[PDB]
Amino acid sequence: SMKIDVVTIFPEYLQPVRQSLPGKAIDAGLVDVAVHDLRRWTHDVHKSVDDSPYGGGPGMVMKPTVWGDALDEICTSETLLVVPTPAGYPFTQETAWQWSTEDHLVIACGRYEGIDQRVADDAATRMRVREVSIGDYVLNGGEAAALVIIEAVLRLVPGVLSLLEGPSYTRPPSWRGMDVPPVLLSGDHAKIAAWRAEQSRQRTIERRPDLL
């Protein structure tokens, strides 16, 4: 069984992935995804989640007192706390495999310039904390990153959801003047495998030379 708790100021962002879980998996207790509005843990009538950065400059920083109360309530000693951030370690398929056998993931979704660093520092003294980037681009908030992480992790949990793969084809054999490569129809399955390997090599050279 896996529990995923997401904490966010935009809880509606995660509702479609919640509803996408198959009922059989939920009923079997294989997976439970819960979403929490961070504003439940604000202190003031204005429900403030952010404040000006120490040292100056633009933007805002999310408040440690609010996040600290949220994580105190949601996390336990078994929690793996995931903090999406463009300044994080890379989230990769290896990470997804590792996290797919965790009992409890908590995803803390940030906004503005991120979460006051003492939140992660303090949490790390009582649980495991993982600051991760999903790619070399900047989002406005952690919610889209949470969606990517949830999808990549949960498709590796049974019954829930080096070289590049080459092109794929289906019927019809000829379409808009373009034929499916005839080798694929040849019934020479060793040759087909070699053809696919060369297609993957060429595609990796063209698109991802870093991988070779």
Ligand X SMILES: Nc1ncnc2c1ncn2[C@@H]1O[C@H](CSCC[C@H](N)C(=O)O)[C@@H](O)[C@H]1O
Residues 125-144 that bind its own copies (CB under 8 A): 131, 134-141, 143-144
Scanning residues 174 to 203, which ones bind ligand X (CB under 6 A)?
A: none
Least distance from its own copies to the Cβ atom of residue 174, Å:
9
The secondary structure of 22-90 as a DSSP string is -HHHHHTTSEEEEEEEGGGG--STT---EEPPTT--SS-EE-HHHHHHHHHHH--TT-EEEEEEEEEEE
Written as six digits, the tokens of 32 are 């439970």
Strands (DSSP E) found in 99-209: 104-108, 128-133, 174-175, 178-179
142 binds, among ligand X, its own copies, none (CB under 5 to 8 A by kind): ligand X
What span, in angstroms and rounded, lies between the C-alpha atoms of 105 and 14? 15
Scanning residues 93 to 122, which ones bind ligand X (CB under 6 A)?
A: 109-111, 113-114
Max CA distance (Å), the chain: 72
- Our finding on whether 165 is near ligand X (CB under 6 A) is yes
Which of 40, 167, 198, 202 forms a contact with its own copies (CB under 8 A)? 167
Strands (DSSP E) found in 113-177: 128-133, 174-175
69 binds, among its own copies, ligand X, none (CB under 5 to 8 A by kind): none
Scanning residues 40 to 69, which ones bind its own copies (CB under 8 A)?
A: 50-57, 60-65, 68
Least distance from ligand X to the Cβ atom of residue 85, Å:
5
Written as six digits, the tokens of 201 are 């090599």
5 binds, among its own copies, ligand X, none (CB under 5 to 8 A by kind): none
- Our finding on whether 178 is near its own copies (CB under 8 A) is yes
Which of 44, 57, 138, 209 forms a contact with ligand X (CB under 6 A)? 138
Q: Which residues contact 199 (CB under 8 A, 6 or more apart)?
A: 166, 167
Q: Return phi, psi of residue 18, to 5°.
A: -60, -50
Which of 173, 194, 197, 202 forms a contact with its own copies (CB under 8 A)? 173
26 binds, among its own copies, ligand X, none (CB under 5 to 8 A by kind): none
